[PDB]
Each structure stands twice: as structure tokens, then as C-alpha cells.
Homo-oligomer: A and B are copies of this chain.
């Protein structure tokens, strides 16, 4: 198994730890952990292209999209590699993350190591929002916290 991790931090109260694990080459990736300091509801959750935090979350660039597709949800064929949909915060502002994804990987051309994980201000509309920004960013608004995705023990 391959293990990777991401510590999410930003300019305000949002902080988290996200773990990724892949048992076999090209098998599904389990994603789990916790984020706190969020507003109750859905928050877009994406792997962005650059592991560049030099100017905070903005230097991470657009969604990680090695296959030049449009934006969608994680259960869509038409999606960016980095499209992990939304995490859900409760009334205590805590999101307990538990995702299994078959498109991201921890090896090869789909590999997310050295990229940035971002948790967003608003819901990702999963490309079903009916403006043109829906098919690019999912309208999830500003970047609340992020981190570079790193190799774990």
C-alpha cells in the first residue's frame, strides 16, 4: 500500500488533516480525515494543479486536469482528475471526510503527490449549476485552506 497526507491551513479558522491510501497500483484511493472551522453545509474539495503555496492557496492554480476534461463531480465520467466533490460540515463546523475515488492515484499520470488539496468557501455544484463557471470551477468560491500532498510513512 502507498500512503500520502495533506495538512490543510489558511488565513482564517479552517484547518484539517487528510490521509490518502492506495492498496494496489491503479486501484481505488481511500481519503479520510477531519476539517474544522467551516460553515455548516457543503464545501468544494479539489486537488489543484500546483503544489505551490508561495502566495497561499491562490498560487495552487486551477483544478488538476491532466486529461483536459471539463469540471464535474467525482461520480461523473466528465470530470477533472482533481474533482473530489464536496465535504460536509456539521453545525459544529466539523467535516468528517470519508471518500473512495477510482480516478485519482498515488502513482502514474493521475498521481496527486506534490499537488495541492483545497477546501473551498461554497458548495461545488459538480458542473450542474447553469452558468459557464460551473463547467470550470463548480462555483465553489474562495480557497479557505490548503496544503501540499506529501509522501507518508
Contact = CB atoms under 8 A, between A and B. Distances in A.
Contacts of A150: 50-53, 114-116, 148-149
A99 interface: no
Interface residues of A, number: 22
* Chain A residues touching B, majority SS: loop
A151 B149 CA distance: 10
A82 interface: no
Interface string A54-78: 1000000100000000000000000
A147 interface: yes
10 contacts: A5-B53, A50-B151, A50-B152, A51-B149, A52-B151, A52-B152, A114-B148, A115-B151, A148-B150, A149-B150
